[PDB]
Design a protein around this ligand. Structure first.
Ligand SMILES: NC(=O)OC[C@@H](O)C[C@H](NC(=O)[C@H]1NCCC[C@H]1O)C(=O)N[C@@H](Cc1c[nH]cn1)C(=O)N[C@H](C(=O)O)[C@H](O)c1c[nH]c(Cl)n1
Ligand SMILES: [K+]
Ligand SMILES: [Mg+2]
Ligand SMILES: [Mg+2]
Ligand SMILES: [Mg+2]
Ligand SMILES: [Mg+2]
Ligand SMILES: [Mg+2]
Ligand SMILES: [Mg+2]
Ligand SMILES: [Mg+2]
Ligand SMILES: [Mg+2]
Ligand SMILES: [Mg+2]
Ligand SMILES: [Mg+2]
Ligand SMILES: [Mg+2]
Ligand SMILES: [Mg+2]
Ligand SMILES: [Mg+2]
Ligand SMILES: [Mg+2]
Ligand SMILES: [Mg+2]
Ligand SMILES: [Mg+2]
Ligand SMILES: [Mg+2]
Ligand SMILES: [Mg+2]
Ligand SMILES: [Mg+2]
Ligand SMILES: [Mg+2]
Ligand SMILES: [Mg+2]
Ligand SMILES: [Mg+2]
Ligand SMILES: [Mg+2]
Ligand SMILES: [Mg+2]
Ligand SMILES: [Mg+2]
Ligand SMILES: [Mg+2]
Ligand SMILES: [Mg+2]
Ligand SMILES: [Mg+2]
Ligand SMILES: [Mg+2]
Ligand SMILES: [Mg+2]
Ligand SMILES: [Mg+2]
Ligand SMILES: [Mg+2]
Ligand SMILES: [Mg+2]
Ligand SMILES: [Mg+2]
Ligand SMILES: [Mg+2]
Ligand SMILES: [Mg+2]
Ligand SMILES: [Mg+2]
Ligand SMILES: [Mg+2]
Ligand SMILES: [Mg+2]
Ligand SMILES: [Mg+2]
Ligand SMILES: [Mg+2]
Ligand SMILES: [Mg+2]
Ligand SMILES: [Mg+2]
Ligand SMILES: [Mg+2]
Ligand SMILES: [Mg+2]
Ligand SMILES: [Mg+2]
Ligand SMILES: [Mg+2]
Ligand SMILES: [Mg+2]
Ligand SMILES: [Mg+2]
Ligand SMILES: [Mg+2]
Ligand SMILES: [Mg+2]
Ligand SMILES: [Mg+2]
Ligand SMILES: [Mg+2]
Lengths: 129, 70, 123
RNA sequence: CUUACCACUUUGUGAUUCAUGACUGGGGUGAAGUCGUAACAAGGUAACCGUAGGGGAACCUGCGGUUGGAUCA
RNA sequence: GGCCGCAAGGUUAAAACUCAAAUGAAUUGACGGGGGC
RNA sequence: CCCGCAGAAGAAGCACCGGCUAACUCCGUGCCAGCAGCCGCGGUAAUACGGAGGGUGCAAGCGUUAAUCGGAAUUACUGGGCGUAAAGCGCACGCAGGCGGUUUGUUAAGUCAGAUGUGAAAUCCCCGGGCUCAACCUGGGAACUGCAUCUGAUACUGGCAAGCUUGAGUCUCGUAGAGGGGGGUAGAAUUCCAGGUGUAGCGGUGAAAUGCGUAGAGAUCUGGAGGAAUACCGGUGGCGAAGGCGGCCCCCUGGACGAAGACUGACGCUCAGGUGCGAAAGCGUGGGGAGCAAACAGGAUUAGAUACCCUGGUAGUCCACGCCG
RNA sequence: UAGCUAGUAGGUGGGGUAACGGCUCACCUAGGCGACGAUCCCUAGCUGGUCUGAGAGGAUGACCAGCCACACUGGAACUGAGACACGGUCCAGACUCCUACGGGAGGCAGCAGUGGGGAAUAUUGCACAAUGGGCGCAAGCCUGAUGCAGCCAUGCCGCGUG
C-alpha cells in the first residue's frame, strides 16, 4: 500500500523533471507543504499551490534554466524502514554545500545551514542537489 | 646425473599416461616414462621391444627410456 | 538483504583455511624420513624429482621436497621441515631445511649459500 | 556412646565420547590401458526434466512436461 | 542426525580432498548425413 | 666524564639481476641436472639451471618459514546481488512479527539543547624540559565518541481521545466464461460375436520374415455386446491461486467485470513457524478392460545390436476410497 | 540442542548470618523460565590497552596497571579485625623417600637450578647503599620485594670500520 507519502512526493518531482513537465500534482499534506515551501525558498521550484477543501491537491511548478532541470538529484533519508537523526555537531553537508538537506527541528522544517545556525539537531528528511 | 647408471631392458606391458613396465637385464622390473625427443619425434613404443634404460641410484624401481630397438 | 533480515541473521565471515596443516602454526617441525624416493612431475614439465616421506613429532605423515643438487638422507634420518609447496608435484606441501640436523648442506655451492646451509669458503 | 548431612569407593544400569579396528562402500587425480560412440550440426532415433522397468559400460523403452530444437523442402 | 512415508523415497544439509579455473553474451573463420540462388 | 700514548693502525656481509620489480654478458649444460610467489623456464648461441666477471638493493645485518590485518566493494552498516553467469519457495491462506492514509487536542517514551557527576594511572595526540642527539624519561593540555540524573524544546515517530473519506469492505441492477462437484444422454470410429454373399489370400517392410486364412479369412451387408475419447466449430479465444479446464441437457456451487446510487469509517500491505491445494509415474483394497503399451516372447539389422524396425503382449492407462508430495 | 524446572516460583511461622534473602526447616498456594533463544553441548580468565585500516570495522589480551580464580587431587573446619589460609591444621587418594617393617616424612604455578617436552626462551651472582614493607621507645634485625650485575643482534636507537 501507500506507506511513505514524502518519498512519493520526491519521486513525482524527479520523474516530472526527467519528463520535462511544467508541473506535477499530488494529494496535499501539511508536512508536504512545509517541505515544498523550504524547497521553493531555496530556488529549486518556481511556486507551489493548494486547492480544494474536501480533498486538497498540492501543485508544484518545476523550473528549467538551460532546458535542463534545476533539480538534478533527490534522495530520501530517514525512510520508514530506517529512521535517521543527527545532532548539531553532525548535520551533514550535501555537494560540499552547494546543495541543501531538509531537517525537521523542534522549531519546524529547515535546511541544515539554518539548523546548525539555530544550534539544533533533528531528522534528515532528504538530500537535494 | 653424476655417476649415471646405464642399462637395457624389455618392455612387457602398456600402461596409461604413456608409462611402461620393463623387465631389466638383471631380473628386476621397473616403471619407465618417455623422454622428450622420442616424444617430440612421435616415436611410439609397443610391447616386446628391447629398450635402453637410464637409472638413478636414488631409486631403482623407476627409470626413463632413451632408445628403442625400432 | 533488508535491514530486518540482517537484524534477524547477521552477515557471516568467510572461514579461512591453512594450506600447511601439519605444521600446526609452528614455523618448523622435526620428523624422521621413513622413506626416500623420487617421483615425476605433471604434464607441461618432465624430470625425475627427489622426495621423502616423514613422520612428524606431532603424529602426522607428510611428503616433503629435498631441494638442491644431491642429498644424503636415509630411511631413518632426522630432518627439519618448513612450509612451501612444489607446484608440479601433486600433494607435496613442505620443504626440507638443508644443513640442519642430519640433512647436510649442498656441496660446493657458491651462490645463495645461506639457502643451502653452506659455510663461507675460506680463502 | 549414638543419629543426621557427606567426599571417596564398590557393585549393577544407562547414557555419552575418544582411540583404534576385522571388514565393506563410494569419491578425486591421470600425456600413447581395454570396449564402445552416448553428447556437440537435424551429432545421423532432437535434446533435456520427474518417474518406473531393463542392460558390460557409456544407455534403451513406457507416461507426462519444456524449447535451453533444425526444416517447413 | 532429526522429521514425514505401507514402500519407493521426500525434506532439512556438511566436511576432508582437488584444480586454477568453471561460466554468460557476443565477434571472425572452419564444419553439418542444415537451407536457398 | 676528562687527559695522555701508538699506529691505519684492532673492525663488512646477505640477497637478487626474463615480466610484476631496481640491475646483463661469457662459459658449462642439453625438457637432463635443476629453478619456481604467479605468468613459466630447460631437448645445442639459455639475460630463467650451475660457475665466473659486472650491476642493483639493504648493511651489523641480510634472507626463508610461521601468524594477523590490508589490497578483497570477496559477507557489501558506511559499501554487492537474484530473466540467461551462483541466487524468486510449485501455488495459496494465515498467527507472532515488520510497516501504515488524513485532521485536531493532549502526553513527553524515542528525538534535540543546556547543566551536574563520572569515564583510575599508564598508553595515544599536542606543546615544553633532561640525558652530547636519538631510543628513553618527564611537566601541562587535549581526548576517552560511553553511562547516569536534573531542567527545557514539541517539527517527526510512539501512546491516549475524538473526527474524516481518498485505501479497504457491504447492498441494488446487469454481462461473459472448456471454473468446480453429481446424474443422465447422443453421434462417429477400433475390437469381439451371430447371420447372408463370397473365394482364396491378407498383413508387414528399405527388403523381408514372424503372424492369420477352407474350421470359410481378408472384402461387403444386417443385428447384438463392451470400453474409452469428443470430427467441424477451434481462434491469432476464454476461465482458474497454481496444477489445469473442450459433445449435449439438468441439479448444487465459487470467482471476476461494468453503470448509478446508498451504507461502514482505515476496518490496510506483507509474513518465519503453521495449514491446505498440487501434472505424470508409483503404492494399498475392490471393480472394469475396446484401443493402446514398460517388462517379456518371436522375426529382422549389424561384427556385435540386451536398440531404433515388424508380429504379439502383461502391469498401467479407466472407476470408488486412502497414500505419495 | 525446543522445551525446562518440585526448594522448583511465591506466602505464613520458627531457626541462622556482621547483614537482606529458600539462606535453612514445617505448613499452604501451583507457580516460575523459553523463540527478545530458556535448557543442553563445545570453547574461553575479564578490562585499560595492543596490531591493522582513511574509516567503519577485523584480529588480539605477551610486557606494565586494575579485577577475578587456583596453590599435588577431593572433602572440612579452627584461629583471627581479616583465611575456610602458596612456604598452617584434620581426613581421603596417587606418587616419592626412610625404617628396627612397628610405623613415619613431603608438595618450586617464590628466586637460582635439574630431568622431560619442544622449532625455541638466561646465573644454583652482589647488596640491603636507594624506595617500600614487618617487628621495635630507639639502636637495630629481617626482606630472591626492590636496586644492580651476568648470558642472548630478540627488538628499537646512535656510532665506527678512516
Ligand atoms: N550395426 C547396425 O546397427 O546396423 C547398421 C545400421 O547402419 C543400419 C541402418 N539402420 C538405421 O538407420 C535405423 N534407423 C531407424 C530405423 C531403423 C533403422 O533403419 C540402416 O542402414 N538402415 C537402412 C536400411 C538397412 C540396410 N540394412 C539394414 N538396414 C535405412 O533404410 N535407413 C533409413 C534412412 O536412411 O533414413 C531409415 O533408418 C529407415 C526407414 N525405414 C527403415 Cl526400416 N529405416
Ligand atoms: K458518516
Ligand atoms: Mg551419435
Ligand atoms: Mg531382463
Ligand atoms: Mg554463445
Ligand atoms: Mg695516539
Ligand atoms: Mg689507506
Ligand atoms: Mg627492470
Ligand atoms: Mg635462483
Ligand atoms: Mg644465469
Ligand atoms: Mg626464476
Ligand atoms: Mg658473481
Ligand atoms: Mg573488506
Ligand atoms: Mg557479486
Ligand atoms: Mg546454464
Ligand atoms: Mg542460473
Ligand atoms: Mg514463480
Ligand atoms: Mg516445496
Ligand atoms: Mg498484525
Ligand atoms: Mg502516521
Ligand atoms: Mg524524553
Ligand atoms: Mg542530551
Ligand atoms: Mg586516562
Ligand atoms: Mg632537548
Ligand atoms: Mg607523560
Ligand atoms: Mg582534560
Ligand atoms: Mg500522534
Ligand atoms: Mg521374397
Ligand atoms: Mg466365419
Ligand atoms: Mg486470466
Ligand atoms: Mg456462479
Ligand atoms: Mg485512526
Ligand atoms: Mg512458510
Ligand atoms: Mg496416476
Ligand atoms: Mg513393439
Ligand atoms: Mg516441603
Ligand atoms: Mg522467614
Ligand atoms: Mg525470625
Ligand atoms: Mg582454559
Ligand atoms: Mg578497507
Ligand atoms: Mg588511521
Ligand atoms: Mg593477564
Ligand atoms: Mg575477547
Ligand atoms: Mg608469563
Ligand atoms: Mg592451606
Ligand atoms: Mg600462607
Ligand atoms: Mg583462596
Ligand atoms: Mg612453595
Ligand atoms: Mg622457577
Ligand atoms: Mg632444563
Ligand atoms: Mg629436546
Ligand atoms: Mg627501611
Ligand atoms: Mg632470612
Ligand atoms: Mg639476596
Ligand atoms: Mg645491541
Amino acid at each position: 500500500s501507500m506507506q511513505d507519502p514524502i518519498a512519493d512526493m520526491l519521486t513525482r518531482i524527479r520523474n516530472g523533471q526527467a519528463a520535462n513537465k511544467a508541473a506535477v500534482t499530488m494529494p496535499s499534506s501539511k508536512l508536504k507543504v512545509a517541505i515544498a515551501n523550504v524547497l521553493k525558498e531555496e530556488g529549486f521550484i518556481e511556486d507551489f499551490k493548494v486547492e480544494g477543501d474536501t480533498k486538497p491537491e498540492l501543485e508544484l511548478t518545476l523550473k528549467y534554466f538551460q532546458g535542463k532541470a534545476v533539480v538534478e538529484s533527490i534522495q530520501r533519508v530517514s525512510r520508514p524502514g530506517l529512521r535517521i537523526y543527527k545532532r548539531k555537531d553532525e548535520l551533514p553537508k550535501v555537494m560540499a554545500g552547494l546543495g541543501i538537506a531538509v531537517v525537521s527541528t523542534s522549531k519546524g522544517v529547515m535546511t541544515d545551514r539554518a539548523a546548525r545556525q539555530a544550534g539544533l539537531g533533528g531528522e534528515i528528511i532528504c538530500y537535494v542537489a | 646425473k653424476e655417476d649415471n647408471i646405464e642399462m637395457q631392458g624389455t618392455v612387457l606391458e602398456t600402461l596409461p599416461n604413456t608409462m611402461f613396465r620393463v623387465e631389466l637385464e638383471n631380473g628386476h622390473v621397473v616403471t619407465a616414462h618417455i623422454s622428450g625427443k622420442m616424444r617430440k619425434n612421435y616415436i611410439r613404443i609397443l610391447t616386446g621391444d628391447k629398450v635402453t634404460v637410464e637409472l638413478t641410484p636414488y631409486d631403482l624401481s623407476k627409470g626413463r627410456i632413451v632408445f628403442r630397438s625400432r | 538483504a533488508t535491514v530486518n533480515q540482517l537484524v534477524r541473521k547477521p552477515r557471516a565471515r568467510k572461514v579461512a583455511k591453512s594450506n600447511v596443516p601439519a605444521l600446526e602454526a609452528c614455523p618448523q617441525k622435526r620428523g624422521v624420513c621413513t622413506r626416500v624416493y623420487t617421483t615425476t612431475p605433471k604434464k607441461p614439465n618432465s624430470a625425475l624429482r627427489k622426495v621423502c616421506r616423514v613422520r612428524l613429532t606431532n603424529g602426522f605423515e607428510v611428503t616433503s621436497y629435498i631441494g638442491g643438487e644431491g642429498h644424503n638422507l636415509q630411511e631413518h634420518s632426522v630432518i627439519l621441515i618448513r612450509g612451501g609447496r612444489v607446484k608440479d608435484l601433486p600433494g607435496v606441501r613442505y620443504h626440507t631445511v638443508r644443513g640442519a640436523l642430519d640433512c647436510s648442506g649442498v656441496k660446493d655451492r657458491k651462490q645463495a649459500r645461506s639457502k643451502y646451509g653452506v659455510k663461507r669458503p675460506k680463502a
